[model samples]
Target chain A: SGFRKMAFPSGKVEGCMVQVTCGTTTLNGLWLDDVVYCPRHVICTSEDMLNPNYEDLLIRKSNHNFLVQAGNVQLRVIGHSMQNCVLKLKVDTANPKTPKYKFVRIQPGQTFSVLACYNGSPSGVYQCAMRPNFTIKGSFLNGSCGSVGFNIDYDCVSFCYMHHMELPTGVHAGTDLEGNFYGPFVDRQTAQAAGTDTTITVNVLAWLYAAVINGDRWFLNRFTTTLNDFNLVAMKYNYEPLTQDHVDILGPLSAQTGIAVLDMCASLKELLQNGMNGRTILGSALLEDEFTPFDVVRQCSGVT
Target chain B: SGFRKMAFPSGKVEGCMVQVTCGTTTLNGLWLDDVVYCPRHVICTSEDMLNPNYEDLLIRKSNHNFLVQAGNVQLRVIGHSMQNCVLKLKVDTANPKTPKYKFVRIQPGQTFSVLACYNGSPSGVYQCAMRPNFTIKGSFLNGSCGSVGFNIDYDCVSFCYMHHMELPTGVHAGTDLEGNFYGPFVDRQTAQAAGTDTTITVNVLAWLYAAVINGDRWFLNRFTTTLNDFNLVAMKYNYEPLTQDHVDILGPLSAQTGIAVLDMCASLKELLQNGMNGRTILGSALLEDEFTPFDVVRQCSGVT
Candidate 1:
């Protein structure tokens, strides 16, 4: 994102310098490079976005069978149709016993910006969407309408992604639409005239208070048991893969990474290559042969 | 890019409390939120299609602006395509002078993964690129006709942010072949009479052995300075005035926080009340008219 100005503050340097800092401790030093640079740090439990590269740290820690505590972490987001974005919470403390928050829709892009502020206890996985109301209207105005508006019956969600590793908190935080019934203002004359294809810029905002507050320890405790397994898969797979699998496991999840997931076999290959080593780990040759009795290694062994 | 799994050594956890260590300084506390967690931190900088969410630590101190320490500092890069990237040591110590090694041609949507092994050599800037000589050609052939191939020309440089934000490196890095060689890669005959438009992934891995260091530094240095000025404008002024100037500046620059620089200006009228305030600092405006005044906040104020 900061490709333009290489050197920080000064904006003089050309190459990029990666920064990974937690609290005050910076695990890795910051420097520049000539080629692509990617490093994976091991995080036991804390899911802080500051110290480590947010995306890398999340995915890496997620794999270690740990809960990523994404406190009031800041993220840089660049959404298309920036105006219509809505913010919602989708919390899944992973206990199958409790329902998980899959995709939380918080705003109707065209109508209004989604805003959620809770005075009461707050901490969970929240999703930010374009339309808060479950009902979606494609063309707001149509048919025999002398009236101000028409129901187009079109529903859709906003797009987002933090990293390739974690699945979206496929949970819908109740829309901030608790008070309002109808959405953003609509134009009646425009609807009756040259059909309006409106683009709403609500500038959705959410604090995402995922704190394991003292009293709420029970929630975290319950979540630890339930969300652990689910979060594991989210951590294991890349964004698209994790998201798709999440849909398969949780059903119709939203906020998916636009990119597609790797094929199953390719994914398995990656899984092995990443976690395996030494003789105990199967080599590509052996693995290939083990699956298909082919290849030079197998032929040399005289094994069909 | 290892958009998969990675493991980091675990630290001790005494009764749910994590024990973290930092340079002989160990902190035994409730490794709660806000505290930097240093297990395995990963930053997923997968903008480039080639490398997705690869992780590595930065080798810079305070940001690049502070100081440049030579030799005593040994900063190295360990990644996939380190060879293609070029690195040049800074000529003068404190003049904000550009590095000898520069960026040549930077393409859009390409990711650069780096691993910085910085150990103090006045620490110069090391650069790199992927598929440097990476040019691809798809050809078509007929029995009597020779072979017709569709070729795409791509040149990667050390410092990419030249001239304008989104403009290709070719424009500032070198010459402007205004829309000359862009291709659609239609089906063509292959040299060996393969199927129509026979395609093959050509990995143009060009290795630069120190000699060609600082190659594109001149162009990038000049271009980046100019573009940074524009970036400041994009971040500072934003858009309130409706004029051709708005498009002139932002149309050429990259988007901020997913908000097109121009769009940001248009919507940020309320947030950037002063017109000169750095509204872009926080990624976006919290509320409309949160700070600045709309009347005097013309979109394009500086340019004639």
Candidate 2:
């Protein structure tokens, strides 16, 4: 009795998983990814829907683990992609003959979110699996003076430029596909710190110093992206090393669906090169000037 | 947001896998290979559990995937696992904050399942990864002629024996930990054939052969206690070969879990040197005469 179709009466669960098993009867349907399809159509009734609110719905922005239910009829759930890194699933009790219900597990560093599926059934149990989140990292560049920062999204895949930069060191910029943005760092501890603001401060100082010392800052600014949101601008900063890991998050950040991690050292590398002083530093804890990416501003009309 | 707990209700599904994510919220639970526990008490329930039949259940096991519902508030699922083969998840999506849904993927031969917790309100949509159905496998040791097969159970360990004397053939006698005992096939064709009768035939032959070889016929005079409703032993033919690769599972089989697979080749090496060709055919397949372990008898009594 495999799943006949994907049917979520409340629409609260978008990317839910499911497992169907037949008994004495066989229902006509198709089960795919997290959706179930009926042979003909999904019948509906006002009561079954019960004024389902599609908006209250949370589009899955990051990966998560959940329990899919359909009344008392429960089966373990899981999802898969051709790609190896992207997978989600729920573990169920083992009983070939007896019904099994398992919990979902998340893949490391992977993220996911939800969708809206309105079914006519009287809110029954659905299947769900584990999901993951995203990570963000970036660098900065400036002609002579400006600040640059980055934001990781809920989905945890894409990165965004943030509004502030504080620093005390060199001036430079760098980014890497391996997630390691190069610049100035006293040690690895500073690189692995969790605070978002701290990372921004480190990036700001590094970028500013690099800008004046390295003749390459001007050309590097145009090399990354023209988008103004994550604009990698550099400004003047003269200070000494502060904390072990000079990165921290400014204002409260929201991880709603994914994650955003700012690479302070990388930001500093692009913003400032190592000044006469070996250590890169930021004078202020916050960026003096903040600008939005042209595309981000256009997409949201203003701030997102 | 993450989940406080997940639940599974009803029906039977096989070869299925699941995934779960714990955004912001930390995972707070204990999980055994087949057991899961959470404060919310997630459980998997089936409809025909009382009379569920796997033969019929197989037909409907394919279409099953996974489903998820929120019992807690919305949460952000993040993080990865140290064990890549077990639950290594990496979050990276197009959007950091918003994702369509989380996805759990199943490898060709792997089944993913999990139990997890999410933070925030329990009303957000999430995705669970998936791959349905997995395989299981093991080896068999037939008993002497006219002997009955026995059932054995072991913890996460192995079993060992140092019996004297060469066992016989025909009477299928093997120690089965899980699953039932099939028959001692009259021939290769019948052994490879499917169907209940075919299986029974194989079991009967194995037991009869093992009894005569292992000299266990002494207990055959009366089928009481240890012999109660003892059934034949069986194994999964589809499992990957038991090479050095699965050392974890293989190590325990060495007299610890009481479920070690006997190395027929090693056992016969010495016998063949002494012109024991009259005993066995080496690796073509296993036989009942090879039975020598005393633990086999104790386990059949149904005592842990």
Candidate 3:
């Protein structure tokens, strides 16, 4: 998604860094990449624009697993005749024994946004732990203005991963949709090199949040788990076949380290090869240089 | 990506939740989602597989912005042919003014892996803050086993945001590729209900890491920024139209809220409608049910 811009916040970087962007639109006004692009993330979609009157027909996109977390999801939808997109909450927690859902419809000329949410006791705290797969597949009912196309910008957020933010003016970092850290290339290799400049740019805060938050946890937890599993895993050696649990813990570690988890033995070899603290694989840098640590001598002065 | 399994640890969930999986392969022995499928994550590709004997050709995938941060990147590459993949050190910090790279190519059928690194001292610590976009596009030159494909498993890690991990045995949650948090699903909804049992099963740790780390940071950071930017924006209005800055900060927030960022004012209406704590949107739940808090004393007994 943020492929449009490398250093600045756009495309993949925007999608990757800004937690809210997981399902929002970019500046140009288009839904994020995987929102409802065919079967990419949409699982499956059945369209009904089957007649010559395509304009009069419909396009329905549905994902059985929309919001994959347990929380009262507040929704604000704006649908229209020429451009209609209805979102349906397709599950029930209060009555888990039975499933419940509703269709949020918006009519034409009636250009107005709709807000929707259910009544649930406030935890006072809740966050989306997962992504939305329950179908937002650009399903336009009642046709488009005159064309067969409908323009819509959708978004949703429960809990985002935009933490550990290292204040603005981020360094020239490059990465894919997965968090495979590159390097500290002197100063502005990305900014200067037009070709290389095509990496994601985090809004300092966005980067800060993830790096300080998820990024740290990714390592610490991975390290902790690695040690915890050491006795068992070392015994098995990447060799004990494969398991869901292994994928759960080592998948990201494997991806980020550029190692193949063929078996526990193979994975173990790479884990060991990468060395502790992942210093060998991801390299090392002063916190100030890589993270630009924050403080309060002037910034965080405690409330004395 | 996740379309594979609606409930199990099959496709998207594996890619989405399991942070280590961001770049690793799935159970079926294939890279998850956007690792490098055609030109998906691999921005561009130039292949030399242009010969009658495709087996004698080469496939080179590179991402100049591979790791977009500055830190020690410990790389472990196992290159081979007939099943070979060669990794290269594409940049340098020692001499940023002058970019440096080295191709660590592996020969054919020669089983075994290779390890490479630079003398950049230690971060004491560092993490892969972003995904790998610099291009691990499966560039298998030399030759394959009479076939034209190369089998390789790649990975890299700097800092991961798998934090604030919630405990295991998650609830029935449904979602999309975007973080549009769903409802307070009842127990066994996803697991028992075949249709909806298709969310992501966090290996407790995987789920916990993210829910705790990146997830929390996602909300906190977004809220902080929203408040931080309240002043000047209230003056310009959701009136000033749009700007790069707006997208930078508000894009994700807008997406999560399901509001289109057409103009500041339009987005403003929805933001206000949603309310603080994001209740109007993602609902609320007893922390115990939704997040499953941890403990000591037996669980959190401290040392007492």
Candidate 4:
């Protein structure tokens, strides 16, 4: 139930990647040659870690089937960026809600280690799909280094805890001068139910506004001067809106309090407005006559 | 400096891989299709882990390559056992160290998670080479799932700490009835430096015997009751000298001390004698009139 300021009553987040209803639909498979965010996976910890040094004596202990702790596991897509290989992650690619070319270029050797976040949590998998001439071929562990595809049997759009907050008094979702709806649902479920599907991602400023209003120290503590320094560097390079993807890194390496939070909200509002204000034919509702600095936070966070 | 017991004053352990002299040789590369016991690789840690939630603010916290902590890294061959993808790992294939078809058939889905140990430490990488029909087509992360090859890497055969023991008096290299020389020269250097070379692996019982002679509670503790149980299960399935790869698993899960150690050496002696008694024209020097059960341990471990 959230927005850049306006909260939706009920909706699920398709954090990254397209959503799949494995729990409710027939199992399906797809061969992709592109980057997939938040892909499905199963985490397997070392079983021998539990046993300690018992392995120094022999290869087979208790007749276990080699190294796997147990079978029946979902495969993890450890993404690798090849040397001279260029795979671009186009945020808001189709039917974009945010409106911008947020092309996240995965440069060479980027395998597995790239951790992306959405809805304020770590997204597990990112797959670099393969295609001829478009994407460079890279090394893959088990799957064909050239061919690609996977079967899905489960749903993973984890509903984050922040979805619980309520909207503020009198404020509601609305469209801008361009008549484009801009509100709580930058997510899949809400937009889809409304007969609209978009590539709109979460607006960091909105999330920050919500944090301040809710007094959620856990969420608020994620911002830092270090984070500002990062976005500044990102801004030193890239394209418009600065996009929520650029700002949400949170870096949470440091902490802020009181005026620090309030000041950030105001500054982020200005920075966001500078990048996004007049760029879209559909304007940000936050910059519309309906929004004030304090009210924007109240509207975005939904507690006031 | 190790043997089943007869320690060479100085010798390097290949652990579980073919040796590479990247530090000494001009860099080179090779492409093959099969299982490589130990391959080259690098470990990358998530930098954001150290940064905390600062990422909640944005994507590029600093001007960093998305996920990799730093650059100048080697590639790790994370092995995977494909379903219906049969790849067999033959221990001592070329040189016959222990003299047996120790085919470690990596069953389906046995990927990188299968941690194998050599010289009392975890061997970092295991690669399944690609070949037509001999190996199954499975999903590999970046390397083409269809094609296979990699550039030569910096040397990665990390030497463990167990190679420093000195040999006992009156024990030295010897040849079997078939003129096959046997001794601490079982490794790459020793045999090559001698007259010829052989693909001999470490004999577990010999290592155990050395542990007993040296009073190494740490090494001895690895031969647990549980380890014996695992060997029994492996025995329930395949072929013989019942190779060292089979027993060295050390599962070390259960500990054996005093009689446990002594008795194991005895049982291992008997097992070796039973298995090798007359199978080959080349007789076991330990089984000749030249040895006793306790003496085999002493001669093998070289710690006596």
Candidate 5:
């Protein structure tokens, strides 16, 4: 939902640093083209910190999936992990549940590939898991040894693997290996263009909330569970439960965040039934037609 | 949506207790307080299941209209039903062909009512048919000829009238000619200590999906009708559709729900092209959002 806003707190920033926090933990950082600049600690320094790029994480973890060109079939996965992980690739020309699996191994900085077909248009979920010798750790911290899975499609190539690998300066190359293609495309020389002022305003909290809510499964899964789930998830990820104060603060940020809105809605639903809450909530133009939690939840949940 | 959930996979309840279908048939039932527990057979017995409360059935049938309360005036339906029939009601502060006819009738023991008024409120469909009357089922399933209609107001009391009247067992009186106010009323007589826990979890589905989607019909109907209408509403609702998928889904649901979601989203208006299901459904969801199917149809039909 917040795909347009590239930065946090405030959308675009120059020398300013954004302090992104989840409970007690906070990452004060600079944004330079897709990566967060956090010194000292890697947790708050990764792109994962600036945004919850779980879908990208899952794609990087997957080994065999590829993309569609106008007429060609190709598969590729770029290798970059703290510990060696096995990429499991599978293709199905028929049934999805039943597909033949192929395995590939690549050292850091190397690429793996394969040639495969899926009848007409191909589709399937590819999976990747760390070798048995390593223990899985928190994904947001220390680059956990967890298995990640993501889906591959028939049209529009997904650049999931691109985000995971860093290329050498001035070297932009596309790799085709074993019927798979991985790009480390080198920048093409172009004439310098005149600079112009680009000032855009965005709801800082809304941007943060959207980035975390839509892309960060790790963050979202923890944030939405029961209050107990909050404690458990936060603890597991080495974070703290977002205090009710955080929610109270976010409630009026357009109540911009879905998590906080659902929180208020649940609370309001109880009071409305008891014949209370409606007056206070509805009375405020701040929360009126815009933030009816129950309605929003119903819409998102696809409830009839 | 839940109309099918009533009888489970089927609409009617027969010897084996067929569930009451909502996307399909209809029913009539009595409302005693906040519960719809009509009996004789067991339709009302299974979730108080099976028998299929027809007014609920009809409300389900029209696929429009929703509920509300307030400092602002509102209209709502309580239900009752029996046999295999129709119960219709029409509403209009005035007008006939332009007045509305909303049909809701049922077999005995069931009652539905509300304290309602529309601020520029509402006017809609009213219709009725005994279908085939045998002694005219009281809707609560007994032989009582009563034509009950209600009012929309700003007040404390929502009248629940039972045609079969009998006074308190201790007093042994007959108060059958009119309405009855039943209460556990523990705090009475002299001074009173408050008492409560009547915790009931109603399917609070009414307020949601209803609020944005239905009453906003005036906004939505224009919004989803056609490309030309889309331009009008795109300007009016003030939204452009997010994607072809968003447009695809919104085209139906009656243009009913999400007038606000797509309110200013103009980009969505194009690709939608021609008459489509999503637009109609979305339109219905919008108009139906506030007034409901029966009501919107009634309003358009002009039933006084």
Candidate 6:
């Protein structure tokens, strides 16, 4: 039904970053540190990326579970405490789809851990599950003498961004292409309390504009990873992160429609740097009086 | 990006019609007339079909052009008048793409007509333009005379709908699949003043619901042509009506998603048959206290 028109340029060109300037103040962050420079790419439209009005409505409608990113891994532990129990932990490191493993027995009230890793090369989705069973081998040595069963499932894929951090109340974070982090506080009082600069207020506003209003996952992902290496943007945000498949579809559409993804990114960067009242921009454009390039793409792409 | 899955069953044995039964009263229209006994079909979301709130907004936004049905055929006449004028009229009817026509001498105030027809089968699109030119041959049989030029374009396809009749303040109309015209009054008192019986108030509501909301161009077409052999739905309506392409896309999506277009139409019918409280349904639905199948489809299909 379509053709691929734009391909990423060869080699990652220092990743994608946004530089916002307000009078004598300037701030920068990595938008595509985890991504390569490309002519076409995935533009996430997840709830976290929705405009403030839309995101608020969605969040209010769904009791927080709808867009809460809980990551891809979960564990369900079962317990059968009949006197003193003997537990066996088994995990398969190879062939995640249908793994086989041998169990090792551990005494009751004892602690144990298993180290496992998957090949990180770009590959399709893979599911791995850990099954744990506990049994009490009594004098009878019965097959089932009070047993505990539990399983944990995890998806094997290299998380694009690896940081998720909880800010103290009114603080927001951003990142550079190199995965460096920056924080903007709510106001002078908040910044003073947190021992941060007062100029962070405007800087954080710009970051919110970029991450939420623009629906720019690249920036959000980098920011999340920089905050907490264990946190993934998709998981914490409860959104479908852009995949290669999405990129493939977008490539041809960009080529055929003459809508460059690069241009869209650049427009956002320019708007942020201009500091022309981000919140009021939408209202102004809607009046048909003033418009930013971002406004045009937002309407045309059905993002708003 | 999608596939066609719901092909209509063979034969157009029964026409699409809708039946409303309330208390001891009964009403019917061509809604399910030609439709198969299924839960899915094309349930139009035309302005007339829009919920009360949305419809009022759209209607108030534009005077009447939004829902007014304009047909595809039109006429353009060229004119000139002088004391000693030997005029030659030329037109090309056969090849509308690039036609060549000749003129004949005719007296002033004399009228003439041209009969033109094109081969209309399974062609993608065919356009017929009637370009009329006038050449005045005066004095020494010279061709240096005034000329009038105009072109009128026509399509060969059957129009979607026609006749967005403004009911002179308090009037309404309805038509059956068989082309029988309904009345234009709200009640006996209203009809006494306006001279009509079939208090088409709610009956015509269903008709508007069918013609504009359900996008029932077929029924509208038959109704218009039956009113007068020369009338067409599109000629009465100025906008492009839903086409086979729309039907194709809707058919498959409805089948696969289990979102029946028929269900939507039935909901509107049920609501219409409820009472003259049709306008209140949308308001109630917005309050989240009441809803019809129409509301479900409207939200799911992004019509709202």
C-alpha DockQ of every model: 0.01, 0.01, 0.01, 0.01, 0.01, 0.02
Off by over 4 Å in 3: A1-28, A31-244, A247-280, A286-304, B1-304
Q: List model 1 lDDT by residue over B1-304, tens digit each.
A: 0000000000101111222222222221111122211111011122322332212222321122222222223112122111111111122222222222232343321222111111110101111122112211111011101000111111111322111111111111111111111122111111211112211111000000000111211111111223334444434543122334434433322222232443333333332333323222111112112111110111111100
Q: Estimate each model's TM-score.
A: 0.16, 0.17, 0.15, 0.16, 0.17, 0.16
| TM-scores (chain A) of the candidates | 0.16, 0.19, 0.17, 0.19, 0.18, 0.18
Docking class of 1: incorrect
**TM-scores of chain B, in order:** 0.16, 0.20, 0.16, 0.18, 0.18, 0.17
lDDT of each: 0.18, 0.21, 0.19, 0.23, 0.23, 0.20
After superposition, candidate 5 runs with Cα above 4 Å error: A1-304, B1-304
**Per-residue lDDT of B1-304 in model 4, one digit per residue for the tens?**
1111111111011112222112211111111223322211101123422222322323322212111100122223333211111111222123211111122222111111111122122211112111111121111111111111111111221221111111121112211112122233221112223222211112334344443433333222233344455355334422112333434432231133234433453454344434433221111222111112333342332220
lDDT of 5 by residue, A1-304 (tens): 1121000000011111222222223323222222222221122223454344333444443322222111132322232122111112222222212222222322221111110011111110111111111111001111111111111121111111211111222111211112121322221223222222111111122333433433322222221234554444334432224445435545544344445533433332332224322122211101111112222222122221
Model 2 residue runs over 4 Å out of place are A1-11, A14-250, A253-304, B1-109, B113-115, B118-304
Worst 10 residues of 5 chain B by lDDT: B2-11
- In candidate 1, stretches whose alpha carbon ends up further than 4 angstroms from where it belongs are A1-304, B1-155, B160-263, B274-304
> For model 3, what is the error of residue A162's alpha carbon versus the real structure, in angstroms, after optimal superposition?
11
Interface RMSD of 3: 22.2
| lDDT: worst 10-residue window of model 1 chain B | B202-211
Off by over 4 Å in 4: A1-304, B1-259, B276-304
